[PDB]
Design a protein around this nucleic acid. Structure first.
Ligand SMILES: [Ca+2]
Ligand SMILES: [Ca+2]
Ligand SMILES: [Zn+2]
Ligand SMILES: [Zn+2]
Ligand SMILES: [Zn+2]
Ligand SMILES: [Zn+2]
Lengths: 265, 232, 265, 48, 252
DNA sequence: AAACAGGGAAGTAG
DNA sequence: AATGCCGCAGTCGGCCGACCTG
DNA sequence: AAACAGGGAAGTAG
DNA sequence: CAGGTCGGCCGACTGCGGCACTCGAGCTACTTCCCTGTTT
DNA sequence: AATGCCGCAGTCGGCCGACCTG
């Protein structure tokens, strides 16, 4: 029966349900038959698997990338630096873009936020030169290059690019500004000190306030590296699509998506 | 098409009027009007009433203007003065021409605030209390210029009022007469992707809507997914 | 208070939560304040609103569109005709594409399926010429042009394009075929008579079998044209994202998405 | 058609007034103010 | 540890208090490190600011430096501009608002730029009161001059490394040092005083014992506890550190 | 001398 | 080194207070 | 006569 | 031995993502290596 | 005239039959 199903799939490349109904076999057998076929396409529609790390304290981990605001003209090279924890964002509109402009943006961001402990970026040539790496090593700031052609590694800063572009569009339609610097400063002011969240906390006071939380809950945890539901473990932070469990034996907290977190009672 | 040219030679209506009357191209009507040497809530609710000065009529330079705020139906007559008697006759003929209005908004003219006017409106049961009427004045003088051999300024003004009310055309194909005796939504341009609006919603239902922007000759049908209210 | 909130939003274009927290107003008031702002962007992320009509009987409503299979060379202009009810699909690989090719494809599809009663397509110039319209009127087949630049109106045939392209890729990787016609015929054979659904029914026997169903359930129904939950009404057909209620007073069945259907007991 | 529309900018159920159209969960209510019609979500619409 | 403090002072020139609070150095050692360098000799925040325009000879063309000083927490912001015109003052106001936020009253001088209709209208639009302070009593002027002197001293200190590409970069570096590095005697940076988390101690803050060095390092904030283990979060650490309760000492 | 039949141009959808 | 997201907005639902009622 | 310093080319990421 | 328990299995369901007439050209920016003018 | 979808695949869960047990 199984050999007949394999031969039929090799001949026609049927569906799993077709084999299951025609050859009177279990659904799992038909699914594995269609999976083992070399000619069958790979499953592109993969569910949520990876989640980018975040800092559990303000000024720990930042992401950074550039964008293009063509309305600025020569100042289209907008630089964006985001704190992953509190979503505190800083932006500069600098003409051109090179090691000099990146260093200037880093200095102004440090003046605006403070010392970070790890800075993640994309794999752009500007963030690879020995000039910027030497500067970061001198200032004792770890740098993570990230996987090339993978914006999901800098998903946080990309979403902040969306927010910043929306705010700039809103304020540009609102009125007139002398220079792109003035408009960008107003947009940053709104986004940081005015654009309050749903818990009554501005981004500025999240980036610069005390860390407080209720007794963290205990949740069943699926370790993807071992494939077993092991727990319970303390859930440090959680949200939409991300979770941060901290097992007692673990050296560092583990970032897993929401699908792998199950409440425990 | 040929008859449209002589109709414009006679009345000098708009290109929309010509095209809706004669089934011609918008470009054809625009070319005709350009070539023309003389062409360079609910109704009866709220009115605006004003008098204008038109020196070309000589002794009859005082033309009182009354326009509906919804249908933009326009009525005007020329008299020797802007006195209380003249305003009273204007109110009588405005009633005769357009029916019963609910509220009338006027300027601070002494005749308009005259007691006889107050008891006039009190007996005809109408309460008493501005850019639209000014644009109406501009339209009236423009049509009077375009109409330039007539017998009397009354005859000329009758011609102008007839053209503006029953010939002159808006986009939706309904004259001032139909509007007097008969919703804005955001829409996303499905081709370019840029959001457009505000535009009037004609008809909608079951996953699609009909939107007719003032700058387009034909209505635009867009999927319901790209419709947002204006709510001014 | 409300005037102050309106002025503040006009000045900064804040968030609804910001106004709600700072000015001590209800959430609905802040939401409408941010909505009424002319400069605020329109809501692009609109939920599922429209659903394309489907036929309640085989051979009633069809959709049709062309695609591009570059592996065929001169025969890349593949034509696809789909019955909306049973998902019965027919395809032809014809060199070029014009009124002549469309008429030939229509004749072969009629030979393959039969007489349809309404044929929906896109707004391509080929389906607009008086030749094809005259042919359809002579054969007593209603034609619906559809909204331009709106593939969601032909979503069914587009998804069938996806399925057909996947099947052609599978069979091309499986072995060798003499002509694109042979490969397309094999793919159509598999998709129609072999690619069985999860209910043990091939597409061919769905397109050509008796219509049977259990006593249709009664469900609360939200009429979008009146905005009121009116019911109960008989639910003729339902699935993923589509529903077809038939009220007693309605002239024709109404197609509404799943979000507007509520079970009734 | 008379409906009860909630002026949720103040929270008062002003009315009655005519209803022009509907759709998208919104009812295009036209109050006595002939300046411009307004759209209100159908959750805040009560037929009279 | 002392050599790390020396490198930190060589990079950023701060006072001894910041070094001793960040690297656990003793008073005399930190002061001696500070002396070693060749060139080292209101009641509520965001309520009352103050502004003034000073001149610096080093910049040359951007000598006009506008400084915004919070009266309570001394959170200092500076900007280098080509002129003192109304447009430049307005841009500096917008950038200061971006840096700090919305104050209640912004005291200024009697310069025509501040008194100009544009600046006053802008301030009234944002619901920000403007106090001209036309009596030239040197109290606010004294404090703003003190801040100007601090900015000039920081610029002179940071001028050791002639690698600053633009005056904006150097000014940003100096502002960063003065705000987020230089600490007071009580152990709080300018940002901490300015943003007001120092009101009480609503969280359990517990002393911690380290195992790598075998020395009681802390005290630090407690995240959670259970099953004989405590999750303490060190200030300088990347991630929380699990610590047995045998090595945990409550701290008041 | 206005009209009829290619040919080209223009516009629109895919 | 080396990993999707989060704001806009519509919606569900439980809590608390004013109103109808046996 | 092999080596050092522009200049160009090539490769890679954005 | 009949009731509670655990394993196999299929119904129902949801995450997801490309179908849309098709694809490339280009610029900035950095590092690394070879050709060639210049050196000791 | 005029409107998203549905297959691939992982997953939840209840039903039925074999196994453990007081
Ligand atoms: Ca990048
Ligand atoms: Ca098509
Ligand atoms: Zn296969
Ligand atoms: Zn004319
Ligand atoms: Zn706004
Ligand atoms: Zn020093």
């Amino acid at each position: 029966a199984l050999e007949s199903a394999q031969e039929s799939h090799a001949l026609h490349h049927q569906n799993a349900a077709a084999l299951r109904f025609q050859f009177h076999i279990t659904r799992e057998q038909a699914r594995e038959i269609v999976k083992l076929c070399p000619n069958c396409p790979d499953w592109g529609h993969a569910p949520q698997l990876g989640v980018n790390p975040r800092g559990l304290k303000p000024r720990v981990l930042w992401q950074m990338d550039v964008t293009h605001v063509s309305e600025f003209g020569k100042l289209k090279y907008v630089h964006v630096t985001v704190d992953t924890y509190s979503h505190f964002t800083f932006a500069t509109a600098r003409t051109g873009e090179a090691t000099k402009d990146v260093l200037q943006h880093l200095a102004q961001s440090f003046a605006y936020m403070g010392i970070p402990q790890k800075i993640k970026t994309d794999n752009a040539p500007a963030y690879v030169s020995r000039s910027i790496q030497e500067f970061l090593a001198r200032w004792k700031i770890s740098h993570v290059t990230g996987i090339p052609y993978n914006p999901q590694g800098q998903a946080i800063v990309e979403r902040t690019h969306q927010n910043i572009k929306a705010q700039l569009n809103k304020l540009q339609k609102a009125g007139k500004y002398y220079t792109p610097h003035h408009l960008l400063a107003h947009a940053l002011f709104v986004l940081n000190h005015v654009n309050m969240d749903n818990q009554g906390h501005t981004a500025a006071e999240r980036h610069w306030g005390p860390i407080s939380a209720d007794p963290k809950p205990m949740v069943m945890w699926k370790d993807l590296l071992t494939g077993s539901w092991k727990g319970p473990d303390v859930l440090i932070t959680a949200g939409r699509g991300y979770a941060c469990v901290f097992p007692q034996d673990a050296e560092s907290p583990i970032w897993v998506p929401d699908r792998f977190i199950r409440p425990f009672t | 098409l040929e008859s449209a040219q002589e109709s414009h030679a006679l009345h000098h209506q708009n290109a929309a009027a010509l095209r809706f009357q004669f089934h011609i191209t918008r470009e054809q009507a625009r070319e005709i009007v350009k070539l023309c040497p003389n062409c360079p809530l609910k109704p009866r609710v709220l009115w605006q009433m004003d008098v204008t000065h038109v020196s070309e009529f000589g002794k009859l330079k005082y033309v009182h203007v009354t326009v509906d705020t919804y249908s933009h139906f326009t009525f005007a007559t020329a008299r020797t003065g802007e006195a209380t008697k003249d305003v009273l006759q204007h109110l009588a003929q405005s009633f005769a021409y357009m029916g019963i209005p609910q509220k009338i908004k006027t300027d601070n003219a002494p005749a308009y605030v005259s007691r006889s006017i107050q008891e006039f409106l009190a007996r005809w049961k109408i309460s008493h209390v501005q850019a639209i009427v000014e644009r109406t004045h501009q339209n009236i003088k423009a049509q009077l210029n375009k109409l330039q051999k007539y017998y009397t300024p009354h005859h000329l003004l009758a011609h102008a009022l007839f053209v503006l009310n029953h010939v002159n055309m808006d986009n939706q194909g309904h004259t001032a007469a139909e509007r007097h005796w008969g919703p804005m939504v955001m829409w996303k341009d499905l081709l370019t992707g840029s959001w457009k609006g505000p535009d009037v919603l004609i008809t909608a239902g079951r996953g699609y809507a009909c939107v007719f922007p003032q700058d387009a000759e034909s209505p635009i049908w867009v999927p319901d997914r790209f419709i947002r209210p204006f709510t001014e």
